[PDB]
Design an enzyme around this catalytic site. Structure first.
Site, PDB file in Angstrom:
ATOM      1  CB  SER A  39      -1.177   0.181   0.810  1.00 16.59           C
ATOM      2  OG  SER A  39      -1.889   0.718   0.868  1.00 16.59           O
ATOM      3  CB  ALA A  40       2.815   2.762   2.450  1.00 13.26           C
ATOM      4  N   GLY A  41       4.528   0.902   0.085  1.00 11.24           N
ATOM      5  CA  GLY A  41       5.825   1.043  -1.023  1.00 11.24           C
ATOM      6  C   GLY A  41       6.969   1.389   0.490  1.00 11.24           C
ATOM      7  CB  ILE A  42       8.494   2.271   3.142  1.00 12.76           C
ATOM      8  CG1 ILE A  42       7.265   2.202   4.050  1.00 12.76           C
ATOM      9  CG2 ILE A  42       8.047   3.209   1.962  1.00 12.76           C
ATOM     10  CD1 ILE A  42       6.390   4.153   5.109  1.00 12.76           C
ATOM     11  N   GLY A  43       6.815  -1.009   3.688  1.00  9.85           N
ATOM     12  CA  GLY A  43       7.043  -1.976   4.825  1.00  9.85           C
ATOM     13  C   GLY A  43       7.295  -3.412   4.169  1.00  9.85           C
ATOM     14  NE  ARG A  44       1.223  -5.700   4.299  1.00 14.91           N
ATOM     15  CZ  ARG A  44      -0.151  -6.634   4.260  1.00 14.91           C
ATOM     16  NH1 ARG A  44       0.155  -6.733   2.862  1.00 14.91           N
ATOM     17  NH2 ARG A  44      -0.841  -6.340   4.968  1.00 14.91           N
ATOM     18  CB  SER A  45       7.421  -2.415  -0.372  1.00 12.52           C
ATOM     19  OG  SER A  45       6.554  -2.989  -0.976  1.00 12.52           O
ATOM     20  CD  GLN A  79       4.437   0.585   6.969  1.00  7.94           C
ATOM     21  OE1 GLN A  79       4.412  -1.018   6.223  1.00  7.94           O
ATOM     22  NE2 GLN A  79       3.779   2.017   6.737  1.00  7.94           N
TER      23      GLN A  79
END
Ligand SMILES: CC(=O)N1C[C@H](Oc2ccccn2)[C@H]2C[C@@H]1CC[C@H]2O
EC number: 3.1.3.48
Length: 282
Positions: free
Chosen positions: A216-222, A262
Site C-alpha cells: 500500500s505505502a511501498g515501504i513495509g512489506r516491500s 515499518q
C-alpha cells in the site's frame, strides 16, 4: 556474532522495539521537495511517505514528471529495485508509463486490493482476457494473457502495448495474496518460496530494467522483500557468509527510500526469513 544468536539473544532479551528505534534514529534524512509541491497532492497516497529527490523515478513527460517511486541501487549485491506505492485512481496510467520507460520485466504486489474493509490500491490490471484496459492519459493498452492461481500466490502474464509505436512486451505480475491483515506471517516458508519464483522468472536479473515492487505505502512489506533478497545474494557472493549485517544493509537501503520496514515485527520477520533462507543458503 552469528545472525541467529543476535536474534536468539534479542528474543531472550525481548529487545526488538529497542533495535528498531536505533535504526529509525540513524536513518538518512534527504529532501523530498518535488513530492510536496501542491500540483502533486493527488499523486500521493500517504502525506508522511514520499520519495527523496535524489533517487525518485522521473516520468518521461514535460507536463509533470512526478510519481511516488524510488530507485534502490545496491552496489555490492549488483541488484536494483523500484519501490512504489499502490497505484491510485488518478495514477494507474503513470504506473504503467513507468514500467514501460524503465524496461521492467516483473511487477511484485504484496497486498490485496481490499484489506481491513478499506481499499489499499486501485484495480490496475484486467481480470478477464476479453476485457482489456486502455490508459488514455499515457497511451498504453494492457491485456490479461494467462493466470496461474496457487495457494499462497498468483502469477499473471500481461501484454503491455505502447499505442504510439505499436511495440508490445510481456510483463509478469507476481501477486503474494496471503500476507495477514494484522502482523506478519508465522513462518517465512511461503514468502521465501515466492521470492525464488520471481528470481526463477528472470525479473530480478541485469538483462532487464529494475523489478517494480509495491504494497500500500511501498515501504513495509516491500522493504521486507528487497532486504531479504539482497542479504541472501550477499551471503552467496562473500567469503564469510557470517559478515552480512542485516541492520547495515537496511540502513544502506534507507539512503534511497524513507521508512523501509515499518514495525519491530517486520524487522524480526526479515531476520527470520534470511535465517531459514541461509540455513539452506550459504
Ligand atoms: C526452507 C525453504 O523452503 N527455503 C526456500 C528457498 O530455497 C529455494 C531455492 C530455490 C528454489 C526454491 N526454494 C530459500 C529460503 C529457504 C531455504 C533456502 C533458500 O534458497
Amino acid at each position: 556474532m552469528e545472525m541467529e544468536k543476535e536474534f536468539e539473544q534479542i528474543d531472550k532479551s525481548g529487545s526488538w522495539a529497542a533495535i528498531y528505534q536505533d535504526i529509525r534514529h540513524e536513518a538518512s534524512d534527504f529532501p523530498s521537495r518535488v513530492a510536496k509541491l501542491p500540483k502533486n497532492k493527488n499523486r500521493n497516497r500517504y502525506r508522511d511517505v514520499s520519495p527523496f529527490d535524489h533517487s525518485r523515478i522521473k516520468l518521461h513527460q514535460e507536463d509533470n514528471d512526478y510519481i511516488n517511486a524510488s530507485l534502490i541501487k545496491m552496489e555490492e549485491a549488483q541488484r536494483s529495485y523500484i519501490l512504489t506505492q499502490g497505484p491510485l485512481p488518478n495514477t494507474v496510467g503513470h504506473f504503467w508509463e513507468m514500467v514501460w520507460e524503465q524496461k521492467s520485466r516483473g511487477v511484485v504486489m504484496l497486498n490485496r486490493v481490499m484489506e481491513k474493509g478499506s481499499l489499499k490500491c486501485a484495480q490496475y490490471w484486467p481480470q478477464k482476457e476479453e476485457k482489456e484496459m486502455i490508459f488514455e492519459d499515457t497511451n498504453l493498452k494492457l491485456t490479461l494473457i494467462s493466470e496461474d492461481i496457487k495457494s499462497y500466490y498468483t502469477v499473471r502474464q500481461l501484454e503491455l502495448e505502447n499505442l504510439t509505436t505499436q511495440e508490445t512486451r510481456e510483463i509478469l505480475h507476481f501477486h503474494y495474496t496471503t500476507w495477514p491483515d494484522f502482523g506478519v506471517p508465522e513462518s517465512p516458508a511461503s514468502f521465501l518460496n515466492f521470492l525464488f519464483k520471481v528470481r526463477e522468472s528472470g525479473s530480478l536479473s541485469p538483462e532487464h530494467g529494475p523489478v517494480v515492487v509495491h504494497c500500500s505505502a511501498g515501504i513495509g512489506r516491500s522493504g521486507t522483500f528487497c532486504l531479504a533478497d539482497t542479504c541472501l545474494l550477499l551471503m552467496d557472493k562473500r567469503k564469510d557468509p557470517s559478515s552480512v549485517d542485516i541492520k547495515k544493509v537496511l540502513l544502506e537501503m534507507r539512503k534511497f527510500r524513507m521508512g523501509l520496514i515499518q514495525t519491530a515485527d517486520q524487522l524480526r520477520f526479515s531476520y527470520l526469513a534470511v535465517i531459514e533462507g541461509a540455513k539452506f543458503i550459504m
